[PDB]
Ligand binder design. Structure first.
Ligand SMILES: Cc1nc(CCNC(=O)N2CCN(C(=O)c3cccs3)CC2)sc1C
Length: 121
């Protein structure tokens, strides 16, 4: 299964599943800085799933590892901003993280396998 390009469509499809999850609602667009005016005091690098999809479609990811870093930043930003570990929006983050990690594991393994096959000789 040694297609070096296959990760891109696999990531498009997973982003589609994440957009159809009710748990993604708060993470679809960049945070509302009018409702959270202290948000940039806490969070240095905002990230959201629309920004991830646009960066993919622009051809500005070279690997699924770079996409995975930006998705993991959505989740670390939610954990850093939350005033409590039982909060609603943080709770949605944990379920969505578990879903994402379950699905991205094979995408990463197949990509890394394809690159090793390319350099085999
Ligand atoms: C429809 C629409 N949606 C937008 C973005 C909505 N995102 C936020 O407002 N967040 C999500 C990230 N976040 C958190 O993780 C936490 C808050 C509380 C505990 S954690 C802060 C609030 S803008 C727009 C036009």
């Amino acid at each position: 299964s040694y297609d070096i390009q296959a990760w891109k469509k696999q990531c498009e499809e997973l982003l589609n599943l994440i957009f159809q999850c009710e748990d993604s609602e708060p993470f679809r667009q960049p945070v509302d800085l009018l409702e959270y005016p202290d948000y940039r005091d806490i969070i240095d690098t905002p990230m959201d799933f629309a920004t991830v999809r646009e960066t993919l479609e622009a051809g500005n990811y070279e690997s699924p590892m770079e996409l995975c870093k930006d998705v993991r930043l959505i989740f670390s930003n939610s954990k850093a901003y939350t005033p409590s570990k039982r909060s609603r929006i943080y709770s949605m983050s944990l379920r969505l993280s578990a879903f994402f990690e379950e699905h991205i594991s094979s995408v990463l393994s197949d990509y890394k396998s394809a690159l090793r096959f390319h350099k085999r000789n």
